[PDB]
């Protein structure tokens with residue numbers, strides 16, 4: 313029984329390029345497949361941006377309650393939460409929840425702007441020891457996912473490490489760490505992705521992403537039953553510009569790497 | 573015609589029974605498939621229980637804030653939220669969110685006890701004009717889903733009509749209808765079911781269900797992009813006790829009934 317064989321078979325049969333990094337926090341062990349290749353993050357980058365604003369809030373203690381104007385011109389495909397508040401305001405906490413738990417691209421843009429642009433999200437990544445991540449565009453163009461383009465990419469291994477530090481480690485202050493985890497656990501978009509490959513009894517927080525080239529991503533923190541948590545990154549992208557999403561590939565990869 | 577033939581084709585390759593009821597609120601049109609047969613509700617019954625508690629909160633002011641004790645003996649499969657509060661408390665708002673947005677079966681049992689048992693949830697259904705719904709057992713046994721058993725069943729037609737009345741109609745007070753819709757839109761478990769058959773721009777609130785006999789259910793309110801909402805019930809059950817879940821079949825049914 314061979315995890316590399318299974319992942320290579322999934323990838324080949326899918327017609328795409330699959331990247332996987334698992335961290336088992338029980339013993340610091342990893343399962344890696346194309347873990348040092350760059351992939352387009354798409355909306356999985358919203359974790360870094362929300363965590364950056366959380367970090368800000370450790371020193372601007374009322375920042376999460378700050379109202380932010382939502383104008384009709386701010387609407388970008390998709391905006392299921394912000395469209396309801398156009399011509400009004402949303403707080404940075406509401407925006408962070410919207411960006412994380414829903415598909416909300418306008419909410420992401422407000423986080424980016426709060427951080428002073430894409431470079432602000434990259435600067436946070438650098439501050440917490442992630443030298444791989446880069447954010448260079450706003451929404452929606454950060455999702456173009458063109459093959460060979462390094463913009464708005466990271467590697468599975470780096471993002472697994474970062475997500476571990478953010479959700480289980482000490483990148484954030486305790487309240488901010490707990491907030492992030494509460495938001496990820498309340499994600500609405502994830503049941504077809506990593507979670508579909510796992511036993512139903514396991515608890516998952518996750519952020520999904522999807523863009524050009526059939527790019528289909530998920531990053532997750534997982535609590536198996538009375539076991540130590542796992543961090544799992546599954547990235548996937550395809551050769552055709554308009555390929556269909558493949559959440560089932562991410563599910564299949566999550567089952568392969570957690571079986572046993 | 574086209575639709576009916578396609579649903580039958582789907583059903584014939586699915587290895588089970590399929591029940592569908594779509595209400596298009598633009599014109600009150602319906603698309604029905606086995607819509608007067610009984611199916612096991614499993615966790616889709618949590619909608620009726622949360623709504624009955626919302627109804628109670630119209631007259632017991634502050635009911636949703638009321639803390640309820642969680643003890644070890646209360647834990648039933650699955651309990652992702654209630655487990656964190658064992659030897660502690662959850663408020664009726666937290667138990668309603670827990671039951672709606674996650675898998676949590678302990679949270680449902682507390683809603684049922686707040687209503688005076690399974691029969692109190694059936695009484696509420698009757699109070700809002702549903703003469704079909706019938707809750708007869710607590711969690712987890714209400715999910716046995718044995719073929720032929722009338723316990724804990726409804727029909728697609730009745731459930732679609734009830735969900736319309738609850739979410740879009742006047743079965744509840746306006747503040748409480750809005751709370752129900754907010755909870756449903758925040759479901760975490762739905763992305764592989766009805767939602768997986770719909771365009772990504774459409775906004776969905778939904779409640780899934782699973783149980784014995786490979787029972788795989790979803791009931792949803794759907795807001796297509798700048799169109800009047802849809803109600804969709806998709807129920808599915810299989811002939812062998814230990815059959816696997818078929819969320820894909822629900823997604824496929826949703827795509828068939830909305831393609832027109």
Ligand SMILES: *C(=O)/C=C/N[C@@H](C(=O)O)C(C)(C)S(=O)O
Pocket residue numbers: 353354355356389390415417452453455456520521522523524772
């Ligand atoms: C987060 O991952 C957001 C992705 N957005 C894109 C998608 O494919 O879902 C679009 C197309 C909505 S965005 O216009 O790039």
Ligand SMILES: *C(=O)/C=C/N[C@@H](C(=O)O)C(C)(C)S(=O)O
Pocket residue numbers: 512614615616649650675677712713715716780781782783784
């Ligand atoms: C809601 O629909 C919950 C159903 N629960 C069951 C499932 O199939 O997920 C179990 C098996 C967890 S419960 O013990 O019946």
